[PDB]
Design a protein around this ligand. Structure first.
Ligand SMILES: [Ca+2]
Ligand SMILES: [Ca+2]
Ligand SMILES: [Ca+2]
Ligand SMILES: [Ca+2]
Ligand SMILES: [Ca+2]
Ligand SMILES: [Ca+2]
Ligand SMILES: [Ca+2]
Ligand SMILES: [Ca+2]
Lengths: 299, 299
DNA sequence: ATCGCCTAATAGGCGAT
DNA sequence: ATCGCCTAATAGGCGAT
């Protein structure tokens, strides 16, 4: 199966990736389109999102005796691992609501690695936006929840959540991304993205990758004497440029105007030097364009 | 938030769980309804499921240099960890298709633990089926993929994927399941389900839990000289009774007619004695009713 | 057939500096 | 503020018996 459509994918990928790389504005258009599409959907279904999210706390009796156990160094002991509440009540719910949009068609293309949510989003809006280049994009959305004890202004991303330059030299070969040296104010690390900047499906469909991050932020009610629960406080939305934009054109990752866009992640010295996660600073990403947004969900 | 609707949930849960327990046929009806609903949907969208699944192999060049690394004891070295392909192309796709059914409404109720897919499925069909008892159920669906080198006739389930008796003695307390001693032909282990047999939402909604397992089975093409890829071969569907049916009425877990329905799982002697996974033998589960089905997807 | 040996990959709370 | 210390929970391939 590996070789059946390989030549056609190879030829199309290389011709199309060059075009994308030389015309960064097209990718930026569809990336902002994806971002604003999530913002719209969260806005149009705010009560539902908050209700199904916060419902986890009301269902407390059903899981109180079997909560996810604490993990990490020195847990304070008053928080409940809230990872899956944001993943389902926010992340999965959004995937369904996006597909219910009148003009949008969703296709779950099989891939062995990647973010929480992945799907080919096809729509006539993308066709005009890209002036006929394509009518589809590969949505790569990952939910990153935090409480009042972690930073609400960063993103810690795994290699499988970032795309690179994706050179594909020879046919019998494949896409390869260059290692990147992340230099922060005090430390540095290597970061190697594993995702290609775009995909070409076996039927010739051109699917530039659009990386979106949804960051639900909960409040710890217990921080207030005798109150209980971890309620939906806000949701940050962030668009991270695909690999061509980050490392090729306009090369945001190397622009002095945006120093420390990337910084060392949370992986410890026991992790493989090539699988370490990287941080993206939302305060800097906020300067390269209308890439970040905050929605108040505490109402 | 923990106490705001607690009394109402408590009162309703206990009255409703007693009714469910004493009328096992209602739960069996909705459980078989959920099973047959997935069978219908897989059947009505077979080309799409197989196409988006198998597409992962055609996209080989895009991930060949960054495949999920091998894990476990003595990997042969010719297989690619295929976990996420089945999760998305089959599991996530089904959740969307079920919600697109005319008469079905889906709600992603937040929960901190549980299976791959979870959602409140509401429909008038459930209302007549349960003769007015309720119009909703909590779908608990987990995707379990296997290749030609693991058994296509079992399921290895985590505590968070099985419900128990769910006694809830006192209000300020919560649901609790009894530990179960799993006795297999050569070994034995404890198994402690963490999920309640039903949920009551803060608005009084009665949501009996319906546990469904989707088992995509891929073929290893490479097992045939020079061919490549891991293609969709079959999909097994299995309905596992909720906790009331397993351990209370009719108590399938303790019925001599179904010896070894459950058996020790895959967790090693280094795992907490209370978090060990348990196996469910599909060949036995197949005897307690029309709980198991096989769909040929290799066409 | 039984069953458990064995490890990749994801996640974010929280302290140390 | 920076950044990495630290561990729960999920998963199924495959050998050992
Ligand atoms: Ca605690
Ligand atoms: Ca639509
Ligand atoms: Ca994830
Ligand atoms: Ca995530
Ligand atoms: Ca290999
Ligand atoms: Ca519907
Ligand atoms: Ca899972
Ligand atoms: Ca699963």
């Amino acid at each position: 199966m590996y070789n059946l459509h390989r030549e056609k994918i190879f030829m199309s990928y290389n011709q199309n990736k060059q075009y994308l790389e030389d015309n960064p504005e097209i990718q930026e258009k569809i990336e902002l389109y994806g971002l604003n599409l999530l913002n719209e959907v969260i806005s149009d279904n705010e009560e539902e999102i908050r209700a199904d999210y916060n419902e986890a706390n009301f269902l407390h009796p059903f899981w109180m005796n079997y909560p996810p156990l604490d993990r990490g160094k020195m847990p304070k002991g008053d928080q409940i691992p809230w990872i899956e509440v944001g993943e389902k009540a926010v992340g999965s719910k959004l995937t369904r609501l996006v597909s219910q949009r009148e003009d949008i068609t969703v296709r779950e293309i099989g891939l062995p690695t990647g973010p929480d949510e992945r799907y080919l989003l096809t729509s006539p809006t993308i066709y005009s936006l890209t002036n006929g280049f394509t009518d589809s994009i590969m949505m790569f959305v990952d939910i990153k929840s935090v409480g009042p004890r972690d930073s609400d202004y960063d993103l810690v991303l795994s290699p499988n959540q970032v795309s690179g330059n994706g050179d594909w030299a020879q046919l019998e070969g494949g896409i390869q991304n260059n290692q990147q040296t992340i230099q922060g104010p005090r430390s540095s690390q290597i970061f190697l993205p594993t995702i290609p900047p775009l995909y070409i499906l076996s039927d010739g469909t051109i699917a530039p990758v659009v990386h979106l991050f949804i960051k639900p932020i909960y409040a710890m009610r217990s921080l207030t004497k005798g109150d209980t629960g971890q309620s939906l406080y806000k949701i940050k939305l962030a668009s991270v440029p695909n690999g061509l934009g980050l490392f090729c054109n306009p090369g945001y990752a190397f622009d002095s105007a945006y120093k420390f866009l990337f910084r060392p992640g949370k992986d410890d010295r026991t992790k493989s030097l090539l699988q370490k996660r990287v941080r993206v600073d939302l305060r800097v990403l906020d300067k390269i364009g209308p890439r970040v947004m905050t929605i108040d969900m505490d109402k």
